[PDB]
């Protein structure tokens, strides 16, 4: 939960440097497309984006290439991307596809709370 | 509830001058984009729009800049915008981001019924 | 139910001449926009379209002008449009807005089954 | 279930050659449009796509022509398309519309598990 | 229920008549619900002439659900309640036949669709 | 419940006062829920002065639900609890009148909308 | 349940055979449901040869759920019912082992996935 | 529950330890659920050392829910179970104080958020 981790860091709201986005379900294409557009369209971008993968039951090559394109459009704007919540099958697929390599193994988290904690800590050390 | 407040004002339907829109969830981007397009596209615009924020659990800088852009496109068409239902965290974020300043502190309401009552009253005083 | 009325007419499937579309919820804008595009884009169009309004809790001037535009794009392709399921408040708004006049009072039905029955009968008398 | 069939084939994840897409509900137009765009936009395409029709209660001529266009855009990229889960009414409509002819009668499956099994087997025989 | 709304209007009504009751089994594990409704039907002073049992939300039935349903219908029959069944899916439809449920209520009282059952019930009540 | 939130604030409160309780019948087969709440109301040491029964989620009522509701309200009245009804749809509203439920609670205690009932309850409690 | 549909067809059936029953624990607080099903199984005249307990919707288990589940399975075993378990998540799977539930039903009767359990049950019933 | 997953891992566990149980009141009309869980807790041979009652899904409480909750906690205390409360919303939080529930469980045992309660419970169990 966002509430608990924010409070452990003396916060009530998400800091400006941090954004969170959840992949809709297995067919996150429409929603991913729009968010990519928003990210490329807004004046100011966050330092860190957490992509929540909890609601993704599986991924085929269409999801993989979509997510790959999505992360690259974030990186090119200086956004560090963290991944959280992939089930055990999607976790395997992300390694297999080179997505873990793409974000960095140290940026993939089994659970959202781990990613949020690490994001808040990185932001504070600054 | 819309029914109760309409009836307190001797009404069964929303008056032509009043529109209501609810932000989808935390990722209201797609839906906000379409409504912005509709608002800019229709011949006649309402005098007052109430944006319901009840279903928004948090907002990052991407939501903030989206909502900011959205409200500005409404203002430029002469639409007065009211905000309702922000939870206690989103309420803080809206102040922090300058969105409360943008709509006017007197146009932000803890609960939908307060905003609807005040909208119906403003419309009637005319 | 579609099953019961189809069977009363000796049918198992919707006849080619008949289409059915349901307005998403109060903010049917995105979905209405896409269906308008589909209707204008496909080679063959149905003779009769039933628009189901059951899931529409209220309508403001933005919904009204959207729905108005939508119905006009259908009429210009020779599509007869029926409306069904409007609650008692939306029913009033549709009269008020001139939408009942636009489709014809005889084409508005309190309940989906009435509209479907009348559509199947009109199609058969041919 | 995907888990059981994958395991019967000695697998934990969907093979790269196989994609799965589910038609949203009766008004799958928006989502079908986006996926068509994705399929035509990505560098690498799967060998086999399974379209799940379980959540489609009925289809009119608008859905039919949409789905027809969708499948043709897949075929032109060398994608073999399987259909699964059509209820007994939609099953009839698909024959009636020439969609079963279009994908091949041997590529239509009453239930998702049948389609997935047959897809995994075809992929392995290679 | 708009299906109910339409059939009522066809028969000149806006409300369910006193003689008719409608009950839905929800999900395959309707046991707790069946039990309470059986209790109410035995407990209330005034019983309906016809009960419609909607089975649309029952995806399968094993022997436990079958005996539960049998017992439930038996309780209604002993109070003089005529029971109609509607909306069994294709496989539950076959189970109902094989297990003697259709026999118990009568072939003429089993309806593929709720609206057929409600239409037939409203017609029977008017003729009485 | 933001409807509750707004009415409480109008009356200077943030919480429901001790004298007021709210209960919702959920779905047309509220029997099991009715039964347990009847039990609690008989079992607890301290009863509220006013109970609001929200009927918004009740799409129709047959004779079984009516007698269930009658019995439930009778149990509350014998403990001195004043019962308000709110949110009956258009057809349930007519049933309530025809079956003697409105008679049982009083015409002045039936409210088309929850917020009217809650407003009236908060006002009555303040005057006491 | 299409998973059920597919396995039935593989075995030449369209309906669940009389010898097989399926029950799902829904959510971590399955106690009230467990209780009623235990009651039905003790109450019905004819019991199935095999029961599958689906645990897919059970996200965690504490000692209260464990003893509830133990007791439930014990009631089924005394009526001669062979119990299969399917779909425990990764952590509930470890709990089941640690608490003696797997011991109670047998290792060979615990299935990662419902379809494996149903396949195995249909095969065992055919061999009998 | 990923919140549970994360806290367990922080403490080196994958499963809830035997000493800890978690129960959630779902919706404002938790009476039937409260009743059954009270029954189970009295019925099982082995009780947990700590129970967390999650109140996140409870939007308001009237006097009936309060006395129901009081009674429930009293039953747990007499079996030696330490009770923690978590997730009361802002108004339920004030009700709990005003009605003597916080007094009943102890101020130090009431947690704004489930994760704080679970962290504190896992720490207390380790120290024992």
Chains A and D contact (Cβ–Cβ under 8 Å for 3 or more pairs): yes
Nearest chain A residue to H5 by CA distance is A111
Contacts with A58 from chain D: Cβ below 8 Å: 2, 13-14, 20
Q: After which residue numbers is chain A interrupted with C–N beyond 2.5 angstroms?
A: none
C1-126 fold: Transcription Regulator spoIIAA (3.30.750)
- The residues spanned by each domain of chain E are 1-128
CB B15 within 8 A of CB F124: no
Give the strand pairing for H50-57 and D108-109.
Answer: unpaired
Distances from the Cα of A122 to the Cα of A23, A48, A73, A103, A108, angstroms: 23, 9, 22, 16, 14
Describe the crossing of helices F31-43 and H31-43 by its angle, rounded to 10 degrees: 70
CB B59 within 8 A of CB B83: no
Q: Give the separation between CA H50 and CA H108, rounded to whole angstroms.
A: 14
The two tokens of residue F40 are 């609690």
- E67, G48: Cβ pair inside 8 Å? no
Disruptive mutation site among E36, E49, E57 for chain F (greatest number of F CBs within 10 Å): E36
With vertex at residue E20, the alpha carbon angle to CA E16 and CA E24, rounded to the nearest 5 degrees, is 90
Q: Give the separation between CA E64 and CA F30, rounded to whole angstroms.
A: 24
User: How does D30-69 read in b/e, with b if 16+ C-beta sit within 10 Å?
Assistant: bbbbbbbebbeebeebbbbbbbbbeebebbbbbbbbbbbb
Nearest chain C residue to B7 by CA distance is C89
Which structural technique was applied?
Answer: X-ray
Disruptive mutation site among G1, G2, G114 for chain D (greatest number of D CBs within 10 Å): G2
Q: Is A66 on the interface with D (CB under 8 A)?
A: yes
**H26: which strand partners?**
H57
Among residues A49, A120, A59, which one has the least CA distance to residue A87?
A59
Q: Give the separation between CA C79 and CA C94, rounded to whole angstroms.
A: 19
Contacts with D114 from chain G: Cβ below 8 Å: 6
Q: What is the edge-to-edge ordering of all strands in the sheet holding H82-86?
A: H20-26, H50-57, H82-86, H110-111
Neighbours of D74 (CB within 10 A): 23
Contacts with F6 from chain B: Cβ below 8 Å: 111-114
Contacts with F18 from chain H: Cβ below 8 Å: 63
Among residues D61, D72, D122, D66, which one has the least CA distance to residue D101?
D72
Distances from the Cα of G87 to the Cα of E86, G53, G114, angstroms: 32, 9, 6
Which residue is it, tokens 């991924």? Answer: A59
Q: Give the separation between CA A73 and CA A81, rounded to whole angstroms.
A: 11
Which runs of consecutive H residues, i.e. helices, occur in chain G?
Answer: 2-10, 31-43, 63-78, 90-98, 101-105, 114-127
The CATH architecture to which G1-128 belongs is: 2-Layer Sandwich (3.30)
The two tokens of residue A87 are 């089930």
Q: Is E12 exposed, middle or buried (0-12, 13-18, 19+ CB in 10 A)?
A: exposed
CB E14 within 8 A of CB F52: no
Resolution (A): 2.2
Overall residue count recorded for chain A in this entry: 126
The two tokens of residue H5 are 């997953």
Which runs of consecutive H residues, i.e. helices, occur in chain B?
Answer: 2-8, 29-41, 61-75, 88-96, 99-103, 112-124
Find all residues with CB under 8 Å of G77, minimum gap 6, and list them: G83
**Sign of the dihedral defined by the CA atoms of residues F71, F73, F74, F75, in that order:** positive
Contacts with H31 from chain F: Cβ below 8 Å: 36-37, 39-40
Beta strands in F1-128 (DSSP E): 20-26, 50-57, 82-86, 110-111
- B42, C92: Cβ pair inside 8 Å? no
DSSP state of A80: E
Nearest chain G residue to H17 by CA distance is G62
């Amino acid at each position: 939960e966002m509430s608990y981790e924010l409070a452990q860091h003396g916060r009530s709201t998400l800091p400006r440097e941090l954004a969170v986005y959840a992949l809709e379900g297995p067919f996150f294409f429409a929603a991913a497309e729009t968010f990519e557009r928003v990210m490329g369209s807004i004046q100011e971008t966050p330092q860190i984006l957490i992509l929540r993968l909890k609601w993704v039951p599986f991924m085929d090559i269409t999801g993989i290439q979509t997510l790959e394109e999505m992360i690259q459009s974030f990186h090119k704007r200086g956004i560090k991307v963290l991944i959280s919540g992939a089930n055990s099958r999607v976790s395997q697929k992300l390694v297999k596809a080179g997505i873990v390599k793409l974000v960095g193994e140290q940026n993939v988290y089994p659970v959202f709370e781990g990613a949020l904690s690490a994001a808040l800590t990185e932001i504070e050390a600054q």
